[PDB]
């Protein structure tokens, strides 16, 4: 029934670089770190993203953030009444701060997110994510 | 396009010490992705190929091994080629590997073919190297571009209506080939289903029927499942990859299934050799072995 065949002739063994000539090892790969970042990135894809632009007042932006996982995400815990964020009305508790002035805060370190949020000025440009209905 | 220029630069490092990179421009790579993507969608998701042909397994960014693979097997179009996926991840030169393969596909669309491995998926290569390699040497936008190209790779190939080819293996959901052909592209690889199993499943001698896969995804299948599969569809061999075999090749269930792996000393942690499969006009099959939590007010 079979229409294929196989070869009984000897097998040809061509040579190839050794381990000394060709170092195929790669210790740079870090699946644990990448996976932590990727999980945060997955949640954002499922979120409703909208732009927001706030002008800083005397009190600042009137927002309190919390980090949630190392690789963290930035979420709003408090919107101070009378602050810029509340008076705008588009930012609510549990909103994720996906981007700030064009810099992504998804799966970042606390040190990175703090540096970015401390360097904001005046009219800050936000990308906000909210859970879809 | 610069296609001849791109290939020439990629082959210029043949005689150098392994590890030397070839840095193509962002636009050249994007061209290769957008044009190979166009070809992939113009060709069937289930390939119907005819001999002669040479079949190769995983590469995983071991670019110079791919060159020696081509050097001994004959650079295209001297020989027709079919790869079973896993071109990226775990190696230091995935970008060179996938660019050379995509270039040849554009140059020789009817004589050079690439199948989708489990590592040609965003959820996987985001973790095991390709995303990092794209971020370091280009931008992540280029990685998204590779994702759109990978999402259109063909899944399986049938050679001469008798040899069935795919990266992983069989699926318990696979009754007719029309289930494969109905798969629409571009598509991600789901965590479960037919497409998942074709890219992930493994043969296992110690399993009767189907069993859970130690990888945490898809299944394992025994020899009886192979024999019944070949009988039902009038095939005589299953050719696949996705597992390291010490001799570059390894048979399963007598001669009804073969596993190919073309990345010698896989990521520098194995001793294994690489191998390929040559099929002639008379469907003779032979083996060539390539042996060496926080808060803040704003
Ligand atoms: Mn694989
Ligand atoms: Mn693999």
Author numbering:
A (entry chain C): 454 to 522, 530 to 593
B (entry chain A): 7 to 298, 1113 to 1118
Question: From the publication, what sentences describe this entry?
Answer:
Phosphoprotein phosphatase 1 (PP1) is a member of the PPP superfamily of protein phosphatases, responsible for most cellular serine/threonine dephosphorylation. Structural alignment showed that the Phactrs belong to a small subset of RVxF-ΦΦ-R PIPs whose shared trajectory across the PP1 surface continues to the edge of the hydrophobic groove, making an additional PP1 contact through an additional motif that we termed the ‘W’ SLIM. These ‘RVxF-ΦΦ-R-W string’ PIPs include Neurabin/Spinophilin (PPP1R9A/B), which play important roles in PP1-dependent regulation of neuronal plasticity, PNUTS (PPP1R10), which regulates PolII and chromatin dynamics, and PPP1R15A/B, which mediate translational regulation through control of eIF2α dephosphorylation. Biochemical and structural experiments show that in contrast to the Phactrs, substrate recruitment and catalytic efficiency of the PP1-Neurabin and PP1-Spinophilin fusions is primarily determined by substrate interaction with the PDZ domain adjoining their RVxF-ΦΦ-R-W motifs, rather than by recognition of the remodelled PP1 hydrophobic groove.
Accordingly, we constructed an analogous PP1-4E-BP1 substrate fusion, comprising PP1(7–304)/(SG)5/4E-BP1(65–83)/G/4E-BP1(112–118), co-expressed it with Neurabin residues 423–593, and determined the crystal structure of the purified complex at 2.36 Å resolution. In the complex, the PP1 catalytic core and Neurabin PDZ sequences were well resolved, along with the 4E-BP1 PBM, which was docked with the Neurabin PDZ domain. The individual domains were largely identical to those determined previously for unliganded Neurabin/PP1 (PP1(1–304), RMSD 0.22 Å over 269 Cα, PDZ(501–592) RMSD 0.39 Å over 65 Cα). However, the PDZ domain in our Neurabin/PP1-4E-BP1 substrate complex structure is oriented at 22° to that in the unliganded Neurabin/PP1 complex, reflecting a slight bend in the C-terminal section of the 5-turn α-helix that connects it to the RVxF-ΦΦ-R-W string.
